[PDB]
């Protein structure tokens, strides 16, 4: 299937 978004934050 389609796009999978990650969750972006400050490391």
């Amino acid at each position, epitope marked *: 299937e389609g*796009v999978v*978004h*990650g969750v*972006a934050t*400050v490391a």
Partner: nanobody
Amino acid sequence: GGSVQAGGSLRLSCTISDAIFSRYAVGWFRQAPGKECELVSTITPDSTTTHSDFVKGRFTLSRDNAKNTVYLQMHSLKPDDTAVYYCASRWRSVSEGCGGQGTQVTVSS
């Protein structure tokens, strides 16, 4: 999100579906205010990393050794790096890469 003065550094983290992390390239994308989404860099499960032309060695990618996280290490940040940064896999266009939960990066002069 992270905010720095010009010349500074900032490390971002992207946690993404484990099934995806194990099998697919993960892309970092960014979108500056009033501008379109653009692809920044990618990293594969074997830690092959690609970069767009505007990176010029300043941003590097790595995968965590234990968890489903990819890191974007940024150095020598400039005000024009101010943007919301995002990560995604299996995108059908670059526009899709900025559709998820992003983090605001602000670089002040």
